[PDB]
Amino acid sequence: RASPPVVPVAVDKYAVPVANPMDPENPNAWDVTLKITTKAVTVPVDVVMVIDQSSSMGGQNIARLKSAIASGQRFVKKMLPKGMATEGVRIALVSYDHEPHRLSDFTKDTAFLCQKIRALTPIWGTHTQGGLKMARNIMATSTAVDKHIILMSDGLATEQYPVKNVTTADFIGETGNANDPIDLVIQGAINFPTNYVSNNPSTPLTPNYPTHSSKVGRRNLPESKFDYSNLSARITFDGVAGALVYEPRFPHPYYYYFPCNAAINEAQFAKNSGYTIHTIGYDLGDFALANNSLKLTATDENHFFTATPANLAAAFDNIAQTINIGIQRGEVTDFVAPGFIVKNLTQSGDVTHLLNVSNGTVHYDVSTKKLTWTTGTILSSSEATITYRIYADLDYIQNNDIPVNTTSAIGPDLGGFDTNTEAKLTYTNSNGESNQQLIFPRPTVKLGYGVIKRHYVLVNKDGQPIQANGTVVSSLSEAHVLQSQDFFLPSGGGHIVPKWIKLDKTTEALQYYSVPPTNTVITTADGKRYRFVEVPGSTPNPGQIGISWKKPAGNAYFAYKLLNYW
Ligand SMILES: [Ca+2]
Ligand SMILES: [Mg+2]
């Protein structure tokens, strides 16, 4: 009925630099993981144990109470396995004879509960309704999701509360089902009248005894029909009670209170409040009235069992539920940031098998650089992850003044470029509430390696950049290319052949290198020869070229003009 607590969810994201070994295609590489973690929920559950300590559980039958005492302690310890540190579970304790006794309010104190169970002692009278009423009183203060009453009895109730403004309509005759407690108690009292029907053998007063036409107390009276003002109140005839209590104010064919039915009636009020009722029958001789009364008192017949060693050992193994699902539905949107590309993602569509994906499926849109991860259901106490490799696009970073992230603190490089513009989980939580949202952390990175490209271009006589046909252009980057571009690698350690110049990540100041052309004379395929010149805008021999983690792609433009041999 009440909703359990929601399973906690948390998200994390981080970029791990690719190292030992570095990525061979591009050392500016990071493995980015997005991670969803679910925790756990124990559903709160309150239990009231109700134990029959009536005289029928003692004397000749003392193995009954002894078994209730042994099994009740076992149940307490099974449901409170960590004692006062047990999450979610509390147990209260009621005993009863001719009146109920509140032995413990709700507690996790297993030693206290077991001590009270060990002190049970047989006392005349079996006021099962009263035990159940006290359990209902105790359970009324519970705010648990699950609420259980466990009744441990030999099943023959012999006392009950008075019925207000009692009339003949508060009683009922044989149902025609020989196994109904009504029919059983009537037949039983016909066969064994002095075992069933309230009578003090010491006094001359005697009840009228029942026949097949007699009427016994109903089990479906409204709660307003019982007088609960005194929780030790009884119905008696001739100063005593019994499995049937004669009501002398009503005539032939004779009317009898039926405590087993009153207890079923009282349990119905508990069921109407949403409580689960378990009954355990300690009369192992198969007395149908007792067992069948306890079956009807329980939530259903499967919540009754006889107190055999095997049934007792197996009972109440997991009274506390744990929530199985942490996320019912989830969608992670992850926009990769400018300057970074995802390894091997060339077209839109399903990229699940191009990434490492623990759960669900991943879609990629090339134009927006957006990963959409459909998680599916994620269980509690679990983690779901996707991991993909990104590379830095050096020429894009060179050509664009990308902002740095000065707010995130997770690294790996504080103050670096974002790997993600935004990543968000939208999900349906463990109770089915949709549109829950969590924002992932923002990794930041600085490039570790740059490049220096050397270009070999044509100028005219007057030092102007030109196309091959002589038309002047605005910049050397537009001029005719005479020789394939190549890369420059300085001396010193830390650089990676063929082109990767190790960068100083601790500064934004350009690191300058002395870059020479590979050659100062170029002879083309057509036999024309070109000689190196230093002109406005062009790189001298050698020339200072600077790179940094923010501007990692330097470009030298070496100018050449035609050598004319006539
Ligand atoms: Ca008598
Ligand atoms: Mg008894």
Residue numbers in the entry: 99 to 418, 419B, 420 to 664
Original authors' sentences:
In this study, we present the crystal structure of the N-terminal half of Mfa5, residues 99–664, at 1.8 Å resolution. The structure consists of three domains (D1 to D3) that build up an elongated shape with dimensions of 46 Å × 48 Å × 164 Å. The first domain, D1 (amino acids 142–418), forms a Rossman fold classified as a vWF domain. The vWF domain comprises a cleft harboring a MIDAS motif with a bound Mg2+ ion. The second domain, D2 (amino acids 105–135 and 423–544), has an IgG-like fold composed of a β-sandwich with three and five β-strands, respectively. Intriguingly, the vWF domain is inserted between strands B (first sheet) and C (second sheet) of the D2 domain. Interestingly, an intramolecular isopeptide bond connects Lys111 of the first β-sheet to Asn518 of the second β-sheet. Instead, the isopeptide bond is stabilized by Thr517 (OG) and by Tyr486 (OH) via a water molecule. D3, encompassing amino acids 547–664, comprises six β-strands in a twisted tube-like β-sheet that can be classified as a ubiquitin-like roll. The D3 domain folds like an incomplete IgG-like domain, and comparison to the IgG-like domains in RrgA and GBS104 lead us to speculate that strands are missing from this domain.
